[PDB]
Amino acid sequence: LTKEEELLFLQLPDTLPGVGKLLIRKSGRVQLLLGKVTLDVTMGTACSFLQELVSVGLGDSRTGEMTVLGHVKHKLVCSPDF
Amino acid sequence: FSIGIGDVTPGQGLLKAKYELLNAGYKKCDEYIEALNTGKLQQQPGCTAEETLEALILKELSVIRDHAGSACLRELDKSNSPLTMALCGSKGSFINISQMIACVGQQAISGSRVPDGFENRSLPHFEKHSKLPAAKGFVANSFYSGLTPTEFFFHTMAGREGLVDTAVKTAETG
Amino acid sequence: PGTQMTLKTFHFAGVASMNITLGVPRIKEIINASKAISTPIITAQLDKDDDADYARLVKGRIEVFLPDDCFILVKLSLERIRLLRLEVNAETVRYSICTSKLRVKPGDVAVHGEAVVCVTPRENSKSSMYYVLQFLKEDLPKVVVQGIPEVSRAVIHIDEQSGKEKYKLLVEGDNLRAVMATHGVKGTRTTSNNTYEVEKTLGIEAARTTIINEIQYTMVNHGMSIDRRHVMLLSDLMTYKGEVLGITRFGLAKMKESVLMLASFEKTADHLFDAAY
Amino acid sequence: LLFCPGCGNGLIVEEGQRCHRFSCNTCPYVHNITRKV
Amino acid sequence: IPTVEEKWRLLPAFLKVKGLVKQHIDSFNYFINVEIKKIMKANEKVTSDADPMWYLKYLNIYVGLPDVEESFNVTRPVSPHECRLRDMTYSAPITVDIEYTRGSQRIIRNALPIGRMPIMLRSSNCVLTGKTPAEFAKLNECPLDPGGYFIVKGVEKVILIQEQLSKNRIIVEADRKGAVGASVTSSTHEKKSRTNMAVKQGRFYLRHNTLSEDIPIVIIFKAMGVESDQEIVQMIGTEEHVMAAFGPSLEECQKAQIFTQMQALKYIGNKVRRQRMWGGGPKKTKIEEARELLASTILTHVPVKEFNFRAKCIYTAVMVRRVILAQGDNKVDDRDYYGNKRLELAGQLLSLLFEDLFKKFNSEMKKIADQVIPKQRAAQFDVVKHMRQDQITNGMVNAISTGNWSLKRFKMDRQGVTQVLSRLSYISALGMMTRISSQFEKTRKVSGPRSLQPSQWGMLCPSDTPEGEACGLVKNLALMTHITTDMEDGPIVKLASNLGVEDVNLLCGEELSYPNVFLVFLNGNILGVIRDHKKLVNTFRLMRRAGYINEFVSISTNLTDRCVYISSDGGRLCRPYIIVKKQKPAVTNKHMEELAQGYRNFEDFLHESLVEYLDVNEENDCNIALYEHTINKDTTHLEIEPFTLLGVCAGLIPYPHHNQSPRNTYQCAMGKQAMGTIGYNQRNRIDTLMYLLAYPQKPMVKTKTIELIEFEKLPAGQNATVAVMSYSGYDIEDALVLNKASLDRGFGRCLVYKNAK
Amino acid sequence: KFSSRHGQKGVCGLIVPQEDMPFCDSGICPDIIMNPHGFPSRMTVGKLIELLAGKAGVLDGRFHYGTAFGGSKVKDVCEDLVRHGYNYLGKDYVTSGITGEPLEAYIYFGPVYYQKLKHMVLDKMHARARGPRAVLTRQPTEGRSRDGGLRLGEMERDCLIGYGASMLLLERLMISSDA
Amino acid sequence: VQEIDVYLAKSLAEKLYLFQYPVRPASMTYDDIPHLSAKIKPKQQKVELEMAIDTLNPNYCRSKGEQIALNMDKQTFCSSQTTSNTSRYAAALYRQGELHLTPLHGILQLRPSFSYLFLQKKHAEEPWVHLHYYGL
Amino acid sequence: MIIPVRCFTCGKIVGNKWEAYLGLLQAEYTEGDALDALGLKRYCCRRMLLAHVDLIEKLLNYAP
Taking alpha carbons only, the member of G42, G28, G53, G27 closest to residue G112 is G53
What's the CA gap between E422 and C123, in Å, rounded? 76
For residue E152, give Cα distances in angstroms to C265, E31, E62, F111: 44, 19, 22, 42
Residue E645 in contact with partner chain B when CB distance is under 8 A:
yes
CB atoms within 10 A of CB E70: 11
Amino acid at C255: M
Amino acid at C53: D
CB atoms within 10 A of CB E247: 16
Amino acid at C123: E
For chain E positions 371-430, those within 8 Å of chain A (CB to CB) are none
Using a CB-CB distance cutoff of 8 angstroms, which residues of chain G are in contact with residue D30? 57-61
F118 is annotated as contributing to ligand binding: no
What's the CA gap between F20 and E357, in Å, rounded? 70
Taking alpha carbons only, the member of E564, E561, E565 closest to residue E512 is E561
* Triad G53, G55, G58: Cα angle to 5°: 120
What's the CA gap between B26 and F159, in Å, rounded? 54
Q: Which of F30, F58, F109 sits opposite H46 (nearest CB)?
A: F58
Residue F170 in contact with partner chain E when CB distance is under 8 A:
no
Q: Which of D1, D9, D37 sits opposite E229 (nearest CB)?
A: D9
Distance (Å) from the alpha carbon of D10 to chain C's nearest alpha carbon: 13
Residue F83 three-state SS: helix
**Chain E residue at shortest CA distance from F64:** E701
Cβ contacts below 8 Å, chain F against chain H, sum to 35
Give strand ranges (E) for B26-165: none
- The domain spans of chain H are 1-64
Amino acid at A38: T
Residue F34 parent element (H or E): strand F32-34
Amino acid at E731: D
Exposed / middle / buried, residue E645 (Cβ in 10 Å: 0-12, 13-18, 19+) = buried
**Chain B residue at shortest CA distance from C11:** B111
Asked if residue E183 lies in contact with residue E209, where contact means CB atoms within 8 angstroms, the answer is no
**Chain B residue at shortest CA distance from C29:** B172
Q: What are phi and psi of E356, to 5 degrees?
A: -80, -35
What's the CA gap between G47 and E631, in Å, rounded? 63
Taking alpha carbons only, the member of E237, A4, A48 closest to residue G107 is A48
Report CB contact under 8 Å: E530, A51.
no
CB atoms within 10 A of CB E213: 11
Residues 6 or more apart in contact with residue G55 via CB below 8 angstroms: G72
Asked if residue E170 lies in contact with residue E322, where contact means CB atoms within 8 angstroms, the answer is yes
What's the CA gap between C73 and C113, in Å, rounded? 10
* Triad E616, E622, E628: Cα angle to 5°: 110
Amino acid at E325: L
What's the CA gap between F135 and F109, in Å, rounded? 62
Residue C230 three-state SS: helix
Biggest alpha carbon–alpha carbon distance for chain H = 40
Q: What are phi and psi of C122, to 5 degrees?
A: 55, 70
What's the CA gap between E117 and E396, in Å, rounded? 7
Taking alpha carbons only, the member of C26, C20, C24, C62 closest to residue C44 is C62
Taking alpha carbons only, the member of E564, B166, E720, E230 closest to residue G21 is E230
What's the CA gap between E247 and E230, in Å, rounded? 11
What's the CA gap between C26 and E599, in Å, rounded? 67
Kindly write down the DSSP assignment for every residue of F27-94, as one continuous string: S---SEEE-TTSSTTT--TTSTTHHHHHHHHHSSS--EE--TT----HHHHHHHHHHTTS-SS-EE--
What's the CA gap between F67 and E656, in Å, rounded? 7
Q: What are phi and psi of E362, to 5 degrees?
A: -70, -35
Cβ contacts below 8 Å, chain B against chain F, sum to 73
Sheet of strand E611-614, all strands in order from the earlier edge strand to the far edge: E611-614, E575-579, E637-638
State how far Cα E346 lies from the chain centre: 9
Residue E628 three-state SS: coil
CB-facing half-sphere around the CA of E171: CA atoms within 13 A:
19
Q: Which of B4, B91, B100 sits opposite F90 (nearest CB)?
A: B4
Kindly write down the DSSP assignment for every residue of A19-77, as one continuous string: -EE----GGG----B-SS--B----------SS--B--B---TTTS-EE----------
Residue G19 three-state SS: strand
Amino acid at D30: V
Mutation target vs F (from E467, E653, E722; most F CBs, 10 A cutoff): E722
Q: DSSP character for E120?
A: P
Using a CB-CB distance cutoff of 8 angstroms, which residues of chain F are in contact with residue B93? 41
H47 is annotated as contributing to ligand binding: no
What's the CA gap between E302 and E306, in Å, rounded? 10
Asked if residue B160 lies in contact with residue B117, where contact means CB atoms within 8 angstroms, the answer is no
Q: Which of B2, B8, B143 sits opposite F105 (nearest CB)?
A: B2
Exposed / middle / buried, residue E188 (Cβ in 10 Å: 0-12, 13-18, 19+) = exposed
What's the CA gap between G41 and G127, in Å, rounded? 6
Asked if residue B118 lies in contact with residue B143, where contact means CB atoms within 8 angstroms, the answer is no
Asked if residue B100 lies in contact with residue F45, where contact means CB atoms within 8 angstroms, the answer is yes
What's the CA gap between C84 and H7, in Å, rounded? 86
| Torsion-angle region of G95 (φ positive above 0: left; ψ -120 to 50: alpha; else: beta) | beta
The answer, yes or no, to whether E and G have at least 3 beta-carbon pairs within 8 Å is: yes
CB atoms within 10 A of CB E273: 12
What's the CA gap between C25 and B173, in Å, rounded? 9
Asked if residue G105 lies in contact with residue G14, where contact means CB atoms within 8 angstroms, the answer is yes
Bridge-based pairing of strands G108-112 and G77-81 is: antiparallel
CB crowding E388-407: b at 16 or more within 10 Å, else e: bbeebbebbbebbbebebeb
